[PDB]
């Protein structure tokens, strides 16, 4: 997720949106010459705190690129304890870390300049500072979670798949996702279980069909009543009539079987 942060951040840079292909590799190049040539609009305000040597950079314009190379270790003394190990890392892909360190100072200067201007309006501000905030925002904030409840149905529509796995997969979803795959496979059966509440309507239909077929058997079942007792005695001679089919062909062939049955003995 932090990898895309590099692409977006100088996308907003109107003159550094295109160099994004090389920007993570030439950001120090941007900090070398573009730091004044192209970074004179936004980061120049942050460069105001770096004016002393930038003012000194006016005196050493002949070797400013040489001198900014001397300043590279002063970028290192900025991270002489926090980022000596990540220094190798931040150059290529962990550039977000030094952007996590770039935003580390970005929020301070805003806080810093806010502190300076608030130091003039503090004639009564502190009388209204430590007290008012605790009752206004906090009271709404507990109720504002309900506001997030509504919108957490709108914006996570494309994020619900995005954010289901990341953390729980190591502890909870490790077996749940496999269970999740198994459940969706069995989800079709459980869908019919919703229809199982309505299953009585076709379940009762089965016994109705034979009853409906019994209704059709009216005047047939009543004959089937006769078809048992009257006719059961007649199947016993019918097994003798079962030979008639073979005997039926033998009828016309009775005279000529004497010259035909010897063929079977030959084979």
């Amino acid at each position: 997720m932090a990898a895309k942060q590099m692409e977006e951040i100088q996308k907003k840079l109107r003159l550094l949106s295109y160099p994004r292909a090389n920007a993570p590799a030439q950001s120090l190049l941007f900090a070398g010459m573009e730091r004044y040539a192209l970074l004179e609009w936004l980061f120049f305000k942050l460069l105001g705190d770096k004016s002393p040597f930038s003012q000194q950079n006016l005196q050493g314009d002949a070797g400013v690129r040489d001198e900014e190379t001397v300043r590279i270790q002063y970028l290192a003394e900025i991270a002489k304890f926090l980022g000596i190990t990540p220094t190798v890392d931040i150059e290529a892909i962990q550039g977000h870390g030094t952007y996590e360190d770039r935003m580390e100072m970005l929020r301070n200067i805003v806080d810093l300049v806010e502190a300076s201007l608030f130091s003039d309006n503090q004639e009564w501000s502190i009388d209204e500072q430590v007290a008012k905030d605790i009752q206004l925002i906090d009271a709404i904030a507990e109720r504002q979670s309900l506001i997030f409840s509504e919108e957490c149905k709108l914006f996570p529509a494309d994020v619900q798949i995005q954010s289901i796995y990341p953390l729980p997969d190591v502890s909870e979803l490790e077996t749940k996702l496999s269970e999740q795959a198994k459940i969706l496979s069995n989800l079709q059966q459980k869908v019919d279980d919703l229809a199982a509440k309505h299953a009585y309507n076709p379940d009762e239909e089965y016994t109705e069909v034979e009853s409906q077929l019994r209704a059709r058997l009216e005047s047939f079942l009543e004959t089937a009543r006769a078809f048992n007792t009257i006719y059961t005695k007649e199947i016993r001679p019918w097994t003798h009539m079962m030979e008639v089919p073979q005997l039926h062909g033998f009828g016309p062939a009775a005279n000529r079987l004497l010259e035909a049955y010897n063929m079977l003995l030959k084979f």
């Binding site: 997030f148 619900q160 995005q162 954010s163 729980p168 058997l217 007649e234």
Partner: protein
């Protein structure tokens, strides 16, 4: 009021926008897990209940219904056609000789049908001989 609104606008990114970025990798799982598991936990318990149900379900559906569904759907068929050609024909044993002689004939009627076609050849021969007469 513009300064008031922009001053208020820097507070949500600590609170509102951060969770759409940070908790979008750290907090959104609550919406995701609960709803599906709400359905998942119910159905998974039903599976064992369905495992409890199948022994009766294999009884009512197959052993009771599908067993008897097969039985019922043919007692009408046998009483309509099956009983006609052997059970009724016992009373018609005088006809069963002729009634059973007919199926023998339909396997042999075209054998005797040579006589009628052996007469039409005279008409066919005259039609065929017409070309020779013209020539």
């Amino acid at each position: 009021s513009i300064a008031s609104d922009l001053g208020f606008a820097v507070a949500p990114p600590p609170s509102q926008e951060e969770l759409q970025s940070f908790a979008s990798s750290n907090g959104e799982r609550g919406d995701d897990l609960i709803r599906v598991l709400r359905e998942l936990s119910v159905v998974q318990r039903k599976i064992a209940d369905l495992q409890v149900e199948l022994q009766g379900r294999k009884d009512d559906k197959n052993v009771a219904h599908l067993t008897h569904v097969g039985e019922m759907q043919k007692k009408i068929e046998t009483l309509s056609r099956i009983t006609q050609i052997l059970k009724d024909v016992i009373q018609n044993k005088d006809r069963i000789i002729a009634r059973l002689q007919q199926p023998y004939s339909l396997d042999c009627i075209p054998v005797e049908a040579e006589y009628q076609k052996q007469f039409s050849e005279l008409l066919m021969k005259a039609a065929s001989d017409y070309g020779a007469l013209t020539a």
